[PDB]
Write an enzyme that holds these catalytic residues in place. Structure first.
Site, PDB file in Angstrom:
ATOM      1  CE  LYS A  88      -4.524  -1.335   1.956  1.00  0.00           C
ATOM      2  NZ  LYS A  88      -5.998  -1.461   1.736  1.00  0.00           N
ATOM      3  CB  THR A 126       4.737   2.344 -30.587  1.00  0.00           C
ATOM      4  OG1 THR A 126       4.329   1.598 -29.441  1.00  0.00           O
ATOM      5  CG2 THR A 126       3.730   3.461 -30.847  1.00  0.00           C
ATOM      6  CB  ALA A 144       1.207   4.397 -26.051  1.00  0.00           C
ATOM      7  CG  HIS A 195       8.044   6.769 -14.932  1.00  0.00           C
ATOM      8  ND1 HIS A 195       9.368   6.527 -15.256  1.00  0.00           N
ATOM      9  CD2 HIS A 195       7.294   5.918 -15.690  1.00  0.00           C
ATOM     10  CE1 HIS A 195       9.399   5.607 -16.199  1.00  0.00           C
ATOM     11  NE2 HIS A 195       8.161   5.215 -16.480  1.00  0.00           N
ATOM     12  CB  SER A 206      -0.685   4.632   3.398  1.00  0.00           C
ATOM     13  OG  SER A 206      -0.860   4.420   2.009  1.00  0.00           O
ATOM     14  CG  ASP A 228     -26.995  15.516  -5.085  1.00  0.00           C
ATOM     15  OD1 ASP A 228     -26.913  15.010  -3.956  1.00  0.00           O
ATOM     16  OD2 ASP A 228     -26.315  16.513  -5.451  1.00  0.00           O
ATOM     17  CE1 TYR A 270     -39.270  22.079  -3.408  1.00  0.00           C
ATOM     18  CE2 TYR A 270     -38.661  24.316  -4.010  1.00  0.00           C
ATOM     19  CZ  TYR A 270     -38.314  22.989  -3.832  1.00  0.00           C
ATOM     20  OH  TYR A 270     -37.024  22.576  -4.091  1.00  0.00           O
TER      21      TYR A 270
HETATM   22 FE   LIG Z   1     -35.034  21.270  -3.402  1.00  0.00          FE
HETATM   23 FE   LIG Z   2       4.702   5.104 -24.382  1.00  0.00          FE
END
Ligand SMILES: [Fe+3]
Ligand SMILES: [Fe+3]
EC number: 3.4.21.-
Length: 689
Positions: free
Chosen positions: A73, A117, A123, A253, A259, A395, A526
């Site tokens: 990790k 390539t 790629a 890179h 972490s 939403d 409302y």
């Molecule tokens: Fe609303």
């Molecule tokens: Fe490449």
């Protein structure tokens, strides 16, 4: 053993060579102390860093992926930067080009001639051939990838490849003698530029190069129009559509670190001083980014022009992306595991009953819908963003964070409209509601635009037609975010009880809870969007067009909305003009849009199909709805989908995020969202540089 410095992870003697002196000059100028730990492979360095034996090392996107993975990790702390000072770039899109004309799409590639390539590349080989994994007809690993590619295209030109076992893969290259298909620039169709010449010349039907190749090979713009790009949705697009029509994005890179207890700040301060004192364009001989004579890219890249600290939100997979991680997973996976991930929907769920409802739906569905869960709405979106989850019903404000992160509206939540519809909706359009600003016709000093000074009636603080949109476009032009320094006195139920934002507010029969976000604060919803206006308190009120003509005519509650006609209220109006609520069909703010299901543009069709079917057994007209599980029905909380929705109904030429939300809506929401910041949105924008 271990001091205050940062322990770098060298993989070669020559790499420890550069570090042996990096450490020496670093004490000499006075800048963070750095010592070297020399292992033997970067893979080695992954493990040393990961168990406190080293602290930092720069890796490729293949190894970033793997270093951020289960056992270890580590995370990306700094991107390298490439290009010139004018234009430095951090990454690029791997792209698929073809002659304008040919009407082949990514799916119909089988059996054409390809130009690549170079074998094993990014790629040119890995990115395109790992994404196409499905159609290939490949068992998985111990099987040379290359004979599944040998069988798939008719002839091709894959540079490095052995024209010995497999000769059609070398078949279309153009070197003569002992250089045909060579794995250098002596094969003239080698590289980005030779993968393109392969295609220009007529040798292949597609080339797999990158965003830039045509721009660099064909300046003119005239010439470049004789080419299209094949997008992942199966369409073709002009060669500067690569940003929205690409195969994968490839990250620069990265330097990684732990972490937990990673020493980030230290490593980053060490990196600013050596970049400052020895970096590109410096006085020195000891140059960080520069190598010796036969020694290449030791430590960092010799190609590089600096480093960059990467947002702390960003981890292994967001740094890489979903398209990249997918390209990696399909190269080393079992056609087994590949069509199980290809077929079923993981549902990002939020919190626990949303948790238990999807696992309810999961078992119920006999596992074609699965469950990932995030602790929030944002962490959910980042999950789908890194391929760990495919879906979430979001939403309109999140849809934009969603569409700002590369994401898309699949199916919309068509409201039935709380009571009764009749009987089909999948194909019935969406409407959406006309957000509108209403006035009294006893008022005449008042137009949209003649408003700083006035009283407002808001529905509540932070709801879509009663706040966010009226405040969006109203505050759009200016770039100040003081949304209380425009009206004299507004009632916005949610705001501070003393401020110019709660002064008109009602309170509980002129008694208790004053300027409080519920029905206890009378001038709220409302409801009291039309009632501070209708009783001459508000000069204007922000509602949907319906609050009037579902409250006027003789209809609210006792005493105010009673004996009130609706031709008494003349709508407002953005144009600058003003008309009656009737035709709010020309005189509105946006149409505040339905809650939709956002996925990536690859999942899209499969997902669409699987939810028309989910809904068909458990949806409102479930032939198993009452009978088993019920789609729309939450555990009283609008769980997974919103409680009052008739069905999920297809978008209909409302396929983009901003084609979906409306462009009045984007503005509103763009103004605001700079006022209220999103780190998934910071993280998102950073990843385009
Ligand atoms: Fe609303
Ligand atoms: Fe490449």
């Amino acid at each position: 053993a271990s001091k205050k410095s940062v322990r770098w992870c060298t993989t070669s003697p020559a790499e420890s060579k550069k570090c042996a002196q990096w450490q020496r000059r670093m004490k000499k100028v006075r800048g963070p102390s750095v010592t070297c730990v020399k292992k033997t492979s970067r893979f080695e360095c992954i493990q040393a860093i990961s168990t406190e034996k080293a602290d930092a090392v720069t890796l490729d996107g293949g190894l970033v992926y793997d270093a951020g993975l289960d056992p270890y990790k580590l995370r990306p702390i700094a991107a390298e930067v490439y290009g010139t000072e004018n234009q430095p770039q951090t990454h690029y899109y791997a792209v698929a080009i073809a002659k304008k004309g040919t009407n082949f799409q990514l799916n119909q590639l089988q059996g054409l001639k390809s130009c690549h390539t170079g074998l094993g590349r990014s790629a040119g080989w890995n990115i395109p051939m790992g994404l196409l994994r499905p159609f290939l007809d490949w068992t998985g690993p111990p099987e040379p990838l290359q004979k599944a590619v040998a069988k798939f295209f008719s002839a091709s030109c894959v540079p490095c490849v052995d024209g010995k076992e497999y000769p059609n893969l070398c078949q279309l290259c153009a070197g003569t003698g002992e250089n045909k298909c060579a794995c250098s620039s002596q094969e003239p169709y080698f590289g980005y530029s030779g993968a393109f010449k392969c295609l220009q010349d007529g040798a292949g039907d597609v080339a797999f190069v990158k965003d830039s190749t045509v721009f660099e090979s064909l300046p003119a713009k005239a010439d470049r129009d004789q080419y299209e790009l094949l997008c992942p949705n199966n369409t073709r697009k002009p060669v500067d559509a690569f940003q929205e029509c690409h195969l994968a994005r490839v990250p620069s890179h990265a330097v990684v670190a732990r972490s937990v207890n990673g020493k980030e700040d230290l490593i980053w301060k060490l990196l600013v001083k050596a970049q400052e004192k020895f970096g590109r364009g410096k006085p020195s001989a000891f140059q960080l980014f520069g190598s010796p004579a036969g020694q290449k890219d030791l430590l960092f890249k010799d190609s590089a022009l600096g480093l960059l600290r990467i947002p702390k939100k960003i981890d292994s997979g967001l740094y890489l992306g979903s398209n990249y991680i997918t390209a990696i997973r399909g190269l080393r996976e079992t056609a087994a595991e590949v069509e199980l991930r290809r077929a079923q929907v993981v549902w990002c769920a939020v919190g626990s009953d949303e948790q238990l409802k999807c696992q309810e739906w999961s078992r119920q569905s006999n596992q074609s819908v699965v469950c990932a869960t995030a602790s929030t709405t944002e962490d959910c979106i980042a999950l789908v963003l890194k391929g760990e989850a495919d879906a979430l019903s979001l939403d309109g404000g999140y849809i934009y964070i969603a569409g700002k992160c590369g994401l898309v509206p699949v199916l919309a939540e068509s409201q039935q409209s709380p009571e009764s519809s009749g009987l089909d909706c999948v194909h019935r359009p969406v409407k959406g509601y006309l957000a509108v600003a209403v006035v009294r016709k006893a008022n005449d000093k008042i137009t949209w635009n003649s408003l700083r000074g006035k009283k407002s009636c808001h529905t509540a603080v932070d709801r879509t037609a009663g706040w966010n949109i009226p405040m969006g476009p109203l505050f759009k032009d200016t770039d100040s975010c003081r949304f209380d320094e425009f009206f004299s006195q507004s009632c916005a139920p949610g705001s501070d009880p003393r401020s110019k934002l709660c002064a008109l507010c009602a309170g509980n029969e002129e008694g208790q809870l004053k300027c409080v976000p519920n029905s206890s604060e009378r001038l709220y919803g409302y409801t009291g969007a039309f009632r501070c206006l209708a009783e001459n308190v508000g000069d204007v009120a922000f509602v949907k067009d319906v609050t009037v003509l579902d409250n006027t005519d003789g209809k609210g509650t006792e005493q105010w909305a009673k004996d009130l006609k609706l031709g008494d209220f003349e709508l407002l109006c953005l144009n600058g003009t003003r008309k009656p609520v009737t035709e709010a069909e020309s005189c509105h703010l946006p149409v505040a849009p339905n809650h939709a299901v956002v996925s990536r543009i690859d999942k899209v069709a499969h997902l669409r199909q699987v939810l028309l079917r989910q809904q068909a057994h458990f949806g409102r007209n479930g032939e198993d709805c009452p009978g088993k599980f019920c789609l729309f029905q939450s555990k009283t909380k609008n769980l997974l989908f919103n409680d009052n929705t008739e069905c999920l109904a297809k978008l209909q030429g409302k396929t983009t995020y901003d084609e979906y939300l409306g462009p009045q809506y984007v503005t509103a929401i763009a103004k605001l969202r700079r006022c209220s910041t999103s780190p998934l949105l910071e993280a998102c924008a950073f990843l385009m540089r």
